[PDB]
PDB file of C-alpha atoms and ligand atoms in Angstrom:
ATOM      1  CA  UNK A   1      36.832  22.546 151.623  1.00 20.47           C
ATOM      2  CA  UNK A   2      37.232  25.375 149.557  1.00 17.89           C
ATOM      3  CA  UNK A   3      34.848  28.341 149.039  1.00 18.10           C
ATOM      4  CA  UNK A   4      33.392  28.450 145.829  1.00 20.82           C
ATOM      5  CA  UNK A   5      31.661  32.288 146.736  1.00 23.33           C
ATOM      6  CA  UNK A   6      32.893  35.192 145.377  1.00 23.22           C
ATOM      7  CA  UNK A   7      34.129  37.923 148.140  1.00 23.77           C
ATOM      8  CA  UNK A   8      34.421  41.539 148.675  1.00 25.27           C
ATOM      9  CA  UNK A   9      31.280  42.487 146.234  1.00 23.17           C
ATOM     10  CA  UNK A  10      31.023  46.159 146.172  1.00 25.63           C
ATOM     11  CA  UNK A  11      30.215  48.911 143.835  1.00 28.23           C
ATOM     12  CA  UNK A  12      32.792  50.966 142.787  1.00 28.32           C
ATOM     13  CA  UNK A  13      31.303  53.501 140.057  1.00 26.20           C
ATOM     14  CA  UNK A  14      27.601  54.579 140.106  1.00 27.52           C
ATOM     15  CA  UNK A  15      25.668  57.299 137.924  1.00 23.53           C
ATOM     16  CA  UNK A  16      21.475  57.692 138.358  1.00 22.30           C
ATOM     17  CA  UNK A  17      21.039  54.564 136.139  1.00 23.39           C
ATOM     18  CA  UNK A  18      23.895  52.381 136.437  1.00 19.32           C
ATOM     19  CA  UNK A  19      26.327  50.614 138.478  1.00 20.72           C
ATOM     20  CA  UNK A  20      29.814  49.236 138.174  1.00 17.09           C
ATOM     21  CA  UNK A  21      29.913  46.657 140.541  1.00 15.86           C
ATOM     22  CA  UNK A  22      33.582  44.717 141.664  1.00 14.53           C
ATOM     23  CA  UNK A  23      34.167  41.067 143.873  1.00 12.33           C
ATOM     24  CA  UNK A  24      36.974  39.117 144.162  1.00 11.97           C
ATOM     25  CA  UNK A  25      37.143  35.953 142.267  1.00 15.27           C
ATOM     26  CA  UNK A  26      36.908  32.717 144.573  1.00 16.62           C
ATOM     27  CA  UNK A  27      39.815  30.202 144.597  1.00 15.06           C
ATOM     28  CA  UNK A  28      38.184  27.486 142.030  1.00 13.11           C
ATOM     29  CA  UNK A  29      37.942  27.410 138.381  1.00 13.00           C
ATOM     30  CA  UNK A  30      34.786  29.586 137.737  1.00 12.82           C
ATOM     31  CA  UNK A  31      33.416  29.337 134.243  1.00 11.74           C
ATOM     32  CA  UNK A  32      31.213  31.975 134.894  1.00 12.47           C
ATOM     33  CA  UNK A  33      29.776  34.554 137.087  1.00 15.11           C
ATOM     34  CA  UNK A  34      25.856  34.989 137.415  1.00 12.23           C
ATOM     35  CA  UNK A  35      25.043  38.480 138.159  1.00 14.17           C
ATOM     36  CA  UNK A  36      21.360  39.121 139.842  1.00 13.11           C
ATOM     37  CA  UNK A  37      19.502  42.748 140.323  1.00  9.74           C
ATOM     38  CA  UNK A  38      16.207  43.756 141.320  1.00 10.77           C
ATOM     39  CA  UNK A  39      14.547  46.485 142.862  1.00 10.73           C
ATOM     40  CA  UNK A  40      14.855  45.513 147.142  1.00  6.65           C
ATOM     41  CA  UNK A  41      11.154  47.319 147.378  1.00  5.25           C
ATOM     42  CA  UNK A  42       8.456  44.432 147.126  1.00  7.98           C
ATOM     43  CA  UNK A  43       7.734  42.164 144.121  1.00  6.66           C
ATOM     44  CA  UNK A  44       9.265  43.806 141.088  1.00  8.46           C
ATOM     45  CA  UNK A  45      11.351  40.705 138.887  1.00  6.04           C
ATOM     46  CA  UNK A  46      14.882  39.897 139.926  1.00  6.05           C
ATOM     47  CA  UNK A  47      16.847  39.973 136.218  1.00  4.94           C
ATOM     48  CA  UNK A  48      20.747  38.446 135.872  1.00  7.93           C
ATOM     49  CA  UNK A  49      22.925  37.997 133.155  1.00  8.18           C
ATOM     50  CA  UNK A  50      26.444  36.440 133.112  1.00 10.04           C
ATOM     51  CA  UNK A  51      29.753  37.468 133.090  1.00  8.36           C
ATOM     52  CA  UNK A  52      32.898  35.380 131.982  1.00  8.14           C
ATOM     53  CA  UNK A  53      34.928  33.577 134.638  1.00  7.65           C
ATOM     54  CA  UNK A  54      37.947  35.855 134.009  1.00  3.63           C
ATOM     55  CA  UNK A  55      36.467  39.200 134.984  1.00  2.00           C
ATOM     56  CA  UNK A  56      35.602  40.221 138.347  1.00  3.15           C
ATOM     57  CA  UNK A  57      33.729  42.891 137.417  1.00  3.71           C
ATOM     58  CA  UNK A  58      30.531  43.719 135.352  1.00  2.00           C
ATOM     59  CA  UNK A  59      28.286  46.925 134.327  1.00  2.16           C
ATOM     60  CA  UNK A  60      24.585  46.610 135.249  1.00  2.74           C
ATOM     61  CA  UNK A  61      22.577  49.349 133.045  1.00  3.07           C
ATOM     62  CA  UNK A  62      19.000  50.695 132.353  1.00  3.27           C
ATOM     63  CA  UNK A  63      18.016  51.307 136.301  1.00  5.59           C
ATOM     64  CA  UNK A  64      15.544  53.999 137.740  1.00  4.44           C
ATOM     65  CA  UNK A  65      17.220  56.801 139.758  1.00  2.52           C
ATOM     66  CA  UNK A  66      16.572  56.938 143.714  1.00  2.00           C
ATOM     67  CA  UNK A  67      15.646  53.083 143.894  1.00  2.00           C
ATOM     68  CA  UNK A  68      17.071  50.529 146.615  1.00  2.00           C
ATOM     69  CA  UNK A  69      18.607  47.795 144.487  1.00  2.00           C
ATOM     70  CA  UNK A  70      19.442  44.183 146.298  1.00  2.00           C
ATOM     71  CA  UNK A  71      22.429  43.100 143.793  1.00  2.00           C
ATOM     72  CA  UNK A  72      24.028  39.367 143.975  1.00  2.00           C
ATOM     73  CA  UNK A  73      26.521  36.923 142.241  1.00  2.00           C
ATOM     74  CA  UNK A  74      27.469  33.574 142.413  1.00  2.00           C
ATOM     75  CA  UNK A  75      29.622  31.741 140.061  1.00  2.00           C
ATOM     76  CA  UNK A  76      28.894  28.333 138.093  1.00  2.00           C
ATOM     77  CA  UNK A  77      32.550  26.632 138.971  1.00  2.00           C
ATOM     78  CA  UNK A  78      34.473  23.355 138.046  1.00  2.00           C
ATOM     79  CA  UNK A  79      35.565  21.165 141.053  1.00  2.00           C
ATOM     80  CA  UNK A  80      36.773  17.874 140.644  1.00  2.00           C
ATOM     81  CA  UNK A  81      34.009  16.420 142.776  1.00  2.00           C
ATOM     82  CA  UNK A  82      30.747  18.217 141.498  1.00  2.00           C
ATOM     83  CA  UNK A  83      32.003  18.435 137.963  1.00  2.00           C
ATOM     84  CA  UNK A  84      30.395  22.223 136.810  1.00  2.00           C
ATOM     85  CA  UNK A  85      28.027  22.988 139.298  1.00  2.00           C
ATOM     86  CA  UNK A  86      26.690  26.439 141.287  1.00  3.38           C
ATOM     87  CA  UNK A  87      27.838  28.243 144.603  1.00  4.07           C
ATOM     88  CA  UNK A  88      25.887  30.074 146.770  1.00  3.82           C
ATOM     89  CA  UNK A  89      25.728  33.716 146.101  1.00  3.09           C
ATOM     90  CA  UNK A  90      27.100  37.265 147.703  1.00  3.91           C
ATOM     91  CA  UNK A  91      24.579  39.806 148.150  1.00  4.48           C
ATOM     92  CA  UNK A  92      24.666  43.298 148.645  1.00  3.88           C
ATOM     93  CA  UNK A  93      22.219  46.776 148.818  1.00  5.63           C
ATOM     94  CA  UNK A  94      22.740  49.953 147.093  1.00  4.49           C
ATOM     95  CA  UNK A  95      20.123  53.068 146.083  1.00  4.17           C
ATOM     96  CA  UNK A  96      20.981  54.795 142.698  1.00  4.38           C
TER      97      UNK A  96
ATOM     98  CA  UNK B   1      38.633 -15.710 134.410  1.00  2.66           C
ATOM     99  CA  UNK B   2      41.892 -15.163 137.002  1.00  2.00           C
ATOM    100  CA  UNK B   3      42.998 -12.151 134.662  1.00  2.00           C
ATOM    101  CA  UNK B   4      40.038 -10.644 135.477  1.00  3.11           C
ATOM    102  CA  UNK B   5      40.674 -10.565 139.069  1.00  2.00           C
ATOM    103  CA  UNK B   6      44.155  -9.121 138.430  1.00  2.00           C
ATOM    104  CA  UNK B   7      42.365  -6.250 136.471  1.00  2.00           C
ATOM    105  CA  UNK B   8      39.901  -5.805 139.026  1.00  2.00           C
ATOM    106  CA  UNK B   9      42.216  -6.157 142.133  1.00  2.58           C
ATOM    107  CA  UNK B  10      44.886  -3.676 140.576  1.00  4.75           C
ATOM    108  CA  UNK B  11      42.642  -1.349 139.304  1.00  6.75           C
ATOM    109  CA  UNK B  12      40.235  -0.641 142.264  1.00  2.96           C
ATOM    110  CA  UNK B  13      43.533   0.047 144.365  1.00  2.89           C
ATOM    111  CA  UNK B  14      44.502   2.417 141.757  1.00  2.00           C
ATOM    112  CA  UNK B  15      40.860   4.137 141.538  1.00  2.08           C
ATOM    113  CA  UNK B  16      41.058   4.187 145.170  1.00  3.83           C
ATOM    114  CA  UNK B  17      44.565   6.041 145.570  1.00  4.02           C
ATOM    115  CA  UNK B  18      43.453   8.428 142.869  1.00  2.00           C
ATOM    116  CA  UNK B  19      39.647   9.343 144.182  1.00  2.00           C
ATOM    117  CA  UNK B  20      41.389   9.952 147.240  1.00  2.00           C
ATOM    118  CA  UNK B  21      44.618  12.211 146.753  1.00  2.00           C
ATOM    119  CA  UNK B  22      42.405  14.020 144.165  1.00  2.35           C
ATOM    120  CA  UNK B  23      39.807  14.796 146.709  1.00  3.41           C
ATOM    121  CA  UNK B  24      42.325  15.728 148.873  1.00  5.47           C
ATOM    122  CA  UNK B  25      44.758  18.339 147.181  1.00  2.72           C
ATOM    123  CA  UNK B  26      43.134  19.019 143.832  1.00  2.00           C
ATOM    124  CA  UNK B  27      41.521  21.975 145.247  1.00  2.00           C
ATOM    125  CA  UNK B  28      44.416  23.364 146.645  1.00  2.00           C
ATOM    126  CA  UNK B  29      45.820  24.546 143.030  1.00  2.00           C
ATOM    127  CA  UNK B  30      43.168  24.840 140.811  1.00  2.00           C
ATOM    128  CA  UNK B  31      44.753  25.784 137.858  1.00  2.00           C
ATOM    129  CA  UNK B  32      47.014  22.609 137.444  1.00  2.00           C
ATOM    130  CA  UNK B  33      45.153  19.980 140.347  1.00  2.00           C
ATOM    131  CA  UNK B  34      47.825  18.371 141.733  1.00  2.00           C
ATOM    132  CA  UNK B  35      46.047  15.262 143.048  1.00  2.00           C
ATOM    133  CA  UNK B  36      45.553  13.948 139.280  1.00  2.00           C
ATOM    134  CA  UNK B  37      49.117  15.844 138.119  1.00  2.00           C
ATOM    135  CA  UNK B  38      50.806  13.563 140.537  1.00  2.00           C
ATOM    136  CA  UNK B  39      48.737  10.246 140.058  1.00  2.00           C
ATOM    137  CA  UNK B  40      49.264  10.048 136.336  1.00  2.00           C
ATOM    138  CA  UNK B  41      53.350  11.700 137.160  1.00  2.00           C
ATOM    139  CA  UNK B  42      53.369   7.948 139.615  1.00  2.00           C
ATOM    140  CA  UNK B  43      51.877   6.089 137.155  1.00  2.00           C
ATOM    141  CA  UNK B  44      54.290   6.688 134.622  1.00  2.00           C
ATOM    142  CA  UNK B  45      57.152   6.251 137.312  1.00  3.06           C
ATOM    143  CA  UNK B  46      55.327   2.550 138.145  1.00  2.00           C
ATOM    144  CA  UNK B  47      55.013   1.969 133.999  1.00  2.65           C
ATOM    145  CA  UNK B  48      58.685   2.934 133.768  1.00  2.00           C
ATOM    146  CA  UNK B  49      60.042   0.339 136.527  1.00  2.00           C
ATOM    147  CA  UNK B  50      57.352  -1.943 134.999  1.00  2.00           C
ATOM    148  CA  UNK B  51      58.996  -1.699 131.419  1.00  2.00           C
ATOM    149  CA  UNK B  52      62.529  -2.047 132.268  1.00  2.00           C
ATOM    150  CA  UNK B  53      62.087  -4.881 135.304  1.00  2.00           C
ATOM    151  CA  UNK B  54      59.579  -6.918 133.734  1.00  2.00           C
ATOM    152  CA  UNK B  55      62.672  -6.952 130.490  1.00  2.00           C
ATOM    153  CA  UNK B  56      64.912  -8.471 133.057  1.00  2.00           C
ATOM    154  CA  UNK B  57      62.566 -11.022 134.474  1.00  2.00           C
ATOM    155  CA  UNK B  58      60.542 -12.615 131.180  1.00  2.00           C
ATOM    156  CA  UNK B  59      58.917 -15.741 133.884  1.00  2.00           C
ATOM    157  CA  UNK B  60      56.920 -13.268 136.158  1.00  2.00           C
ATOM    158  CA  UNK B  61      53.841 -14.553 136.485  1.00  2.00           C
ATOM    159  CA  UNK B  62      50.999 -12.786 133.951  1.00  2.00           C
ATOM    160  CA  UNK B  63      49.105 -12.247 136.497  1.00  2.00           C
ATOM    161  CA  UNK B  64      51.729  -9.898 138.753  1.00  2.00           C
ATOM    162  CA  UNK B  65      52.219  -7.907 135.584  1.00  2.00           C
ATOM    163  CA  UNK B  66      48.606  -7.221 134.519  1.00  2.00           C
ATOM    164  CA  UNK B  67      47.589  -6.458 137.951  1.00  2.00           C
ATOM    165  CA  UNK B  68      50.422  -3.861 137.937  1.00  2.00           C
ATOM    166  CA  UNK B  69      49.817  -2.274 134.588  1.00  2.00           C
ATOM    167  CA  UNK B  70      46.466  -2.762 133.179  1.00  2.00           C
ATOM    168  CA  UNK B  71      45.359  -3.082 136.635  1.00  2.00           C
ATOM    169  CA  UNK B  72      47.030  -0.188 139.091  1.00  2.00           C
ATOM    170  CA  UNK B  73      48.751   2.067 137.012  1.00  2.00           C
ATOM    171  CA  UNK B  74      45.862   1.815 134.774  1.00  2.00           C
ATOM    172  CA  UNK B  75      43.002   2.436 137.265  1.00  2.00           C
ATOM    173  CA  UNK B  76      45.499   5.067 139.131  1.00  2.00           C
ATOM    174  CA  UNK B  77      46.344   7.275 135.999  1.00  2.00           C
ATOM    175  CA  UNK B  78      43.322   9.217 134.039  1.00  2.00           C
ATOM    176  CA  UNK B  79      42.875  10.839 131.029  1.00  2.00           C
ATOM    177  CA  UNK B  80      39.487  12.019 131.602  1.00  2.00           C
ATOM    178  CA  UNK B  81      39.882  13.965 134.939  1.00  2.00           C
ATOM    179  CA  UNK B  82      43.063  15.726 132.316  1.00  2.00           C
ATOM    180  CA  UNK B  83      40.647  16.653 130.010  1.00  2.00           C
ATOM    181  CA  UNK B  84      37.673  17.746 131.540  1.00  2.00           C
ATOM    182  CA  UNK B  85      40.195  20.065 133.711  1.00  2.00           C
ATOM    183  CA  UNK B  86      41.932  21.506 130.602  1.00  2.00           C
ATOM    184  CA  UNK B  87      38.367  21.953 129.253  1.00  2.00           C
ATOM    185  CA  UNK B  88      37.341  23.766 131.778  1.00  2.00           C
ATOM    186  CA  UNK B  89      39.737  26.104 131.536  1.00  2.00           C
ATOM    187  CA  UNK B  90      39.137  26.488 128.210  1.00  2.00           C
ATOM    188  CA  UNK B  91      35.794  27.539 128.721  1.00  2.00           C
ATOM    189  CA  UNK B  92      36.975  29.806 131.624  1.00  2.00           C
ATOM    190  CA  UNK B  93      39.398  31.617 128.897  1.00  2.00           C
ATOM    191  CA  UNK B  94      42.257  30.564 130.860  1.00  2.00           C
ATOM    192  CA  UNK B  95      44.372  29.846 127.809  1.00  2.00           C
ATOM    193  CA  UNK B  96      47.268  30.123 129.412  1.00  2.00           C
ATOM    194  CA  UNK B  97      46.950  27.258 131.957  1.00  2.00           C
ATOM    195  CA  UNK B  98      45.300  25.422 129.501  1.00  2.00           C
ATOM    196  CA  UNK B  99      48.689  25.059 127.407  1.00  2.00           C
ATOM    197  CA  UNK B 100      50.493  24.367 130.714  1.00  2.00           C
ATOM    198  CA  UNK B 101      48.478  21.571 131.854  1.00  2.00           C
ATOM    199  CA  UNK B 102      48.858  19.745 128.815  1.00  2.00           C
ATOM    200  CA  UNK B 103      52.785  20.349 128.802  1.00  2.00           C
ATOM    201  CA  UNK B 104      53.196  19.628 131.932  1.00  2.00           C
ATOM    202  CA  UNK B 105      50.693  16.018 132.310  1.00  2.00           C
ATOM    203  CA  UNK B 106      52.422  15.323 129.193  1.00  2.00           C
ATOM    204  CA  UNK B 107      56.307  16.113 129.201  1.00  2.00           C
ATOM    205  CA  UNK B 108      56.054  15.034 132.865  1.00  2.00           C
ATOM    206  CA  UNK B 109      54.568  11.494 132.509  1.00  2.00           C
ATOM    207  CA  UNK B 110      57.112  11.029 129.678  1.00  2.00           C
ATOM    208  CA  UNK B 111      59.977  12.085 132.269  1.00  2.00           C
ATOM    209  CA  UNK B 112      58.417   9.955 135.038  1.00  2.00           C
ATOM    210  CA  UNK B 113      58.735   6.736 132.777  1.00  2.00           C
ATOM    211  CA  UNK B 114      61.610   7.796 131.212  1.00  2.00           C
ATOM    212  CA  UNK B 115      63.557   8.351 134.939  1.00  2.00           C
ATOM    213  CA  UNK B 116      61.706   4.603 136.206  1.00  2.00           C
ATOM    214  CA  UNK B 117      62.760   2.823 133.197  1.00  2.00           C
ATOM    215  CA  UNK B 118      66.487   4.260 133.623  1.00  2.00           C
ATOM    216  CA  UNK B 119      66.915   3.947 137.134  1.00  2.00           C
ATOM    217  CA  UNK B 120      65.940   0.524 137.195  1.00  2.00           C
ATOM    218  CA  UNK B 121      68.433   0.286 133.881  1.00  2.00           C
ATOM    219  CA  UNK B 122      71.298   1.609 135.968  1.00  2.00           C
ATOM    220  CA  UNK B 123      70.885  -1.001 138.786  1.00  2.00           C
TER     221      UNK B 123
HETATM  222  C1  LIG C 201      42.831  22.091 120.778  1.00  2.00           C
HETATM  223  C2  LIG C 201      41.665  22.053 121.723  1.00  2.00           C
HETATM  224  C3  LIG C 201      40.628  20.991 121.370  1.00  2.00           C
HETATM  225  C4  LIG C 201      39.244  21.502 121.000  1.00  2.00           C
HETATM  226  C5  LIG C 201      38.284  21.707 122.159  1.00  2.00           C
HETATM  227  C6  LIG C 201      37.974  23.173 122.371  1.00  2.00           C
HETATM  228  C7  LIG C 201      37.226  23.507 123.654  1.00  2.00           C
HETATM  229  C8  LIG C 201      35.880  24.165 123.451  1.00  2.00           C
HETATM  230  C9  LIG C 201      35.920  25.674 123.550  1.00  2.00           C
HETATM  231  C10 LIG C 201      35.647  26.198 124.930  1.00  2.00           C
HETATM  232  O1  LIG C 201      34.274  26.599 125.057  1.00  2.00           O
HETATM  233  C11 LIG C 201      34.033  27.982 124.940  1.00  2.00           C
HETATM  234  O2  LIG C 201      35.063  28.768 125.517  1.00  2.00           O
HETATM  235  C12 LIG C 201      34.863  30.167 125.302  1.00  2.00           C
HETATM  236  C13 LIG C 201      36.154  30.867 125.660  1.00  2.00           C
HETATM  237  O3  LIG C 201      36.397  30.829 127.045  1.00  2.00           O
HETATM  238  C14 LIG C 201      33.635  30.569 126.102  1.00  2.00           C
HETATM  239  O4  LIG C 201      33.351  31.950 125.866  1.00  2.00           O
HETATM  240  C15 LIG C 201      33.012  32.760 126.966  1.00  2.00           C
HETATM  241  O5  LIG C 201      34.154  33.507 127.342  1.00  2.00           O
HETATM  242  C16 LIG C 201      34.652  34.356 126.293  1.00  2.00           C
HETATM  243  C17 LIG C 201      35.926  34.979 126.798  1.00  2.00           C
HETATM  244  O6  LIG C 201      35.717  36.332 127.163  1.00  2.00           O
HETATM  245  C18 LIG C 201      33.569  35.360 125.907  1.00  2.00           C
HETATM  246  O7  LIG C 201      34.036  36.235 124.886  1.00  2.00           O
HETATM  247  C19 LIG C 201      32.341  34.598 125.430  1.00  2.00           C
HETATM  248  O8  LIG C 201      31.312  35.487 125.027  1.00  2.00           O
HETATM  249  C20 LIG C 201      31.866  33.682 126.547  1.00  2.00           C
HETATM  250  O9  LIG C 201      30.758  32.926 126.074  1.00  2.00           O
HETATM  251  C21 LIG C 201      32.436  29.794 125.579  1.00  2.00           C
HETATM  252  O10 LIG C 201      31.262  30.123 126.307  1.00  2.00           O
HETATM  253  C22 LIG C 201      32.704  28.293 125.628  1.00  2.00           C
HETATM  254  O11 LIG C 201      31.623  27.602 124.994  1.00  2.00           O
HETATM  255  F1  LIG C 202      51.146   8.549 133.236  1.00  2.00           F
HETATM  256  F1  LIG C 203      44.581  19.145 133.809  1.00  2.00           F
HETATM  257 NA1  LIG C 204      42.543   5.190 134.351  1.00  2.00          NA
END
């Protein structure tokens, strides 16, 4: 019924080797965010971390300059039927 | 056992009511889900009318009242739903709404027996 994916993901600050990256939150109890990052160019490893359910935004550090990065999150949410469980996630592209 | 029944009977009807208004408006407010605000708000109105009509009327049938109490208001209200939401929010760092679901489940399920036990009083 309601959407449990987060909206509006953009990045709003950028230098050569990092990006500040923005969503809105979803309308459900999110415990936390899971961010994901990896280069978009072939098989290099896709790395996340979380992010508490209050913010709606998050730094993502230690990038190479000039490289196409695919960035996502999804949230892990409470709902009153699934208990905690996981949306599916918001994707985006962006080249330091 | 015929008390059995009564708990069974009562208490699947109030499972029933509370699966589905849950399902149906708890997402609609997530920070205080009104589906199990306003199941556990009606079953302290029901315990309330309960308290101050079964007073009045000391032959009603065991049965009637067990199905009622133990049975629907029982299976109908929840602590567990309560907590698992407040904990939730706890987890989320929503501290805030945290506090006010606990007030308000609390404070409000006092009122709701309080205002079924006097209405029923007053008549
Ligand atoms: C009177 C009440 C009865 C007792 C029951 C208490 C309930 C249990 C505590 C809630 O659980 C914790 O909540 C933290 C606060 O939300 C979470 O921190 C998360 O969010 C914090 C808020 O920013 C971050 O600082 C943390 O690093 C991050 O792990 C943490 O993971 C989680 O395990
Ligand atoms: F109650
Ligand atoms: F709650
Ligand atoms: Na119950």
């Amino acid at each position: 019924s309601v959407s449990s994916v987060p909206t509006k993901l953009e990045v709003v600050a950028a230098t050569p080797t990092s990006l500040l990256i923005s969503w809105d939150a979803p309308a459900v109890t999110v415990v936390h965010y899971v961010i994901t990052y990896g280069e978009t160019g072939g098989n290099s490893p896709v790395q996340e971390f979380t992010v508490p359910g209050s913010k709606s935004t998050a730094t993502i550090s230690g990038l190479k300059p000039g490289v196409d990065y695919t960035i996502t999150v999804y949230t892990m949410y409470y709902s009153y039927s699934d208990l905690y469980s996981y949306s599916s996630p918001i994707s985006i592209n962006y080249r330091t | 056992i015929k008390s059995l029944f009564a708990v069974i009977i009562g208490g699947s009807v109030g499972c029933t009511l509370r699966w589905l208004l849950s399902t149906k408006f708890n997402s609609l407010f997530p920070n205080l889900p009104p589906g199990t605000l306003v199941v556990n708000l009606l079953a302290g109105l029901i315990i309330g009318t309960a308290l101050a009509y079964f007073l009045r009327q000391p032959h009603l049938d065991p049965f009637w009242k067990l199905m009622i109490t133990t049975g629907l208001c029982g299976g109908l209200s929840t602590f567990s739903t309560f907590s698992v939401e407040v904990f939730a929010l706890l987890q989320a760092g929503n501290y805030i709404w945290a506090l006010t679901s606990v007030l308000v489940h609390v404070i409000g399920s006092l009122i709701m027996t309080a205002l079924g036990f006097f209405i029923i009083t007053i008549l």
